């Protein structure tokens, strides 16, 4: 896309050790699957295109971008070593939204609905085996 958007977060790096865990499998098959199909998922299914949205300050304010398209790639391409890394990515995505946008803006209500579902699912994250 535009040279004015940053490169997306890393999704592939052979130097980073990878592992499948039951908790990572749950994050893909339960957590990502649940949030991805939500009515309000669409603004979070890819990196924020600050050029198209006419938000030239977006990447001035948000220095740790994350989105569910990136997370889906990271889970599908086994990028992670543990569940905490992936949970951290979800939390970063929500916090980016809450930092950039006014409370009660539509995008914030959409993030909050996805976060409520996320919390319910993560409370049920299985014991690591
Ligand atoms: C937070 O800034 C945004 C503005 C517009 C859309 Br669509 C998505 C955004 O973030 C996920």
UniProtKB/Swiss-Prot annotation:
Residues 19-125 form the Bromo domain. The NET domain mediates interaction with a number of chromatin proteins involved in transcription regulation (NSD3, JMJD6, CHD4, GLTSCR1 and ATAD5). The C-terminal (CTD) region mediates interaction and recruitment of CDK9 and CCNT1 subunits of the P-TEFb complex. It is also required for maintenance of higher-order chromatin structure. It comes from the Eukaryota. It is linked to Cornelia de Lange syndrome 6: A form of Cornelia de Lange syndrome, a clinically heterogeneous developmental disorder associated with malformations affecting multiple systems. It is characterized by facial dysmorphisms, abnormal hands and feet, growth delay, cognitive retardation, hirsutism, gastroesophageal dysfunction and cardiac, ophthalmologic and genitourinary anomalies. CDLS6 inheritance is autosomal dominant. A chromosomal aberration involving BRD4 is found in a rare, aggressive, and lethal carcinoma arising in midline organs of young people. Translocation t(15;19)(q14;p13) with NUTM1 which produces a BRD4-NUTM1 fusion protein. Phosphorylation by CK2 disrupt the intramolecular binding between the bromo domain 2 and the NPS region and promotes binding between the NPS and the BID regions, leading to activate the protein and promote binding to acetylated histones. In absence of phosphorylation, BRD4 does not localize to p53/TP53 target gene promoters, phosphorylation promoting recruitment to p53/TP53 target promoters. JQ1, a thieno-triazolo-1,4-diazepine derivative, and I-BET, a benzodiazepine derivative, have been tested on tumors with success. Treatment with GSK1210151A (I-BET151, a I-BET derivative) has strong effets on mixed lineage leukemia and promotes myeloid differentiation and leukemia stem-cell depletion. The gene is BRD4. The record marks 101 as: Acetylated histone binding. Interacts with p53/TP53; the interaction is direct. Interacts (via CTD region) with CDK9 and CCNT1, acting as an associated component of P-TEFb complex. Interacts with RELA (when acetylated at 'Lys-310'). Interacts (via NET domain) with NSD3, CHD4, BICRA and ATAD5. The interaction with BICRA bridges BRD4 to the GBAF complex. Interacts (via NET domain) with JMJD6 (via JmjC and N-terminal domains); the interaction is stronger in presence of ssRNA and recruits JMJD6 on distal enhancers. Interacts with NSD3. Interacts with NIPBL. This is Bromodomain-containing protein 4. It is found in: Nucleus; Chromosome. Changing residue 106 to G: Found in a patient with a neurodevelopmental syndrome; uncertain significance.
């Amino acid at each position: 896309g535009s040279h004015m958007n940053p490169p997306p977060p890393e999704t592939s790096n052979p130097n980073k050790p990878k592992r499948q865990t039951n908790q990572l499998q749950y994050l893909l098959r339960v957590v990502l699957k649940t949030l991805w199909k939500h009515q309000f998922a669409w603004p979070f299914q890819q990196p924020v295109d600050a050029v198209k949205l006419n938000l030239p300050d977006y990447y001035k304010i948000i220095k740790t971008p994350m989105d569910m398209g990136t997370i889906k790639k990271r889970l599908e391409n086994n990028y992670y070593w543990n569940a905490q890394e992936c949970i951290q990515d979800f939390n970063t995505m929500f916090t980016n939204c809450y930092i950039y946008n006014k409370p009660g803006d539509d995008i914030v209500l959409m993030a909050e609905a996805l976060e409520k579902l996320f919390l319910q699912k993560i409370n049920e994250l299985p014991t690591e085996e």
